[PDB]
Amino acid sequence: WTVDKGTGTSSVVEYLANAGPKGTEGAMRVAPVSVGTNVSQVQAVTNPGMFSMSCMVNIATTPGNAGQVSIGFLDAAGNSLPGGVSANLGTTTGWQVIGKNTLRGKVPIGAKQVRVNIQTVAGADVKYAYLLCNVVKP
Amino acid sequence: WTVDKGTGTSSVVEYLANAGPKGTEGAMRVAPVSVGTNVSQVQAVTNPGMFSMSCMVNIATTPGNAGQVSIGFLDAAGNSLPGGVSANLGTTTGWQVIGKNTLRGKVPIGAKQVRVNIQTVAGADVKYAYLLCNVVKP
Secondary structure (H helix, E strand, O other): OEEEOOOOOOOEEEEEOOOOOOOOOOEEEEEOOOOOEEEEEEEEOOOOOEEEEEEEEEEEEOOOOOEEEEEEEEOOOOOEOOOOEEEEOOOOOEEEEEOOOOOEEEOOOOOOEEEEEEEEOOOOEEEEEEEEEEEEOO | OEEEOOOOOOOEEEEEOOOOOOOOOOEEEEEOOOOOEEEEEEEEOOOOOEEEEEEEEEEEEOOOOOEEEEEEEEOOOOOEOOOOEEEEOOOOOEEEEEOOOOOEEEOOOOOOEEEEEEEEOOOOEEEEEEEEEEEEOO
16 A cells, blocks of 8 residues: 655554454554545556445544545556546544445546545544455456 | 576576477576576466466486475565465476476465566576466456
């Protein structure tokens, strides 16, 4: 996972053992300060395809929308393509599922890469687990 | 194939025509000096998957165990993952099959690349042929 805290120098992004939904699995806690932190991963993908992702998110505290989880597609040169999807985390506390009707779609024509990004706003304390994406091809 | 002789500048790694098991195919001869020579190749692979590999090896001379053939898995970021396997070449001379109950397993989740390494110890002279690995999946 690529952790970009930006200028948010003291932002806390940490692995926590036994902190997931069941208490037996790992979790990633992101607590940005002043400015937001983005955690991302990029992998190879090809058209045609269909995808759906689910996430386990536990927002402890937030000053508003806690952030967003996004899926983007890139061509061979790294340029963004149409077909991106995003799910806002909201403000409701407790372990919850993201995102049933949001993080889904078709693999865009020309896509070489798929990138997931987890954005947590400044002032939010959120734990993430089970970042599961599946891409099914014909 | 990537030939890494390490500190052994005098190590001999050569292609030999008509030197394989049948006398009609190519073979690679490795005769390392001072330190062992490692020949490797990396290719992309991802979960889900299962794999098995076989090798044809002819040990001409060896001081001890002639070396090993290994398969390892790496993610996109270059981290080594569990599920690696290795097969020792032993001391028996003549064309023989390596990897039957050793170079096999499941592709670990998160794996983005698979790397084979052929290791020949210093002072050993062995020929390799038919380095056939299969990952069953489309």
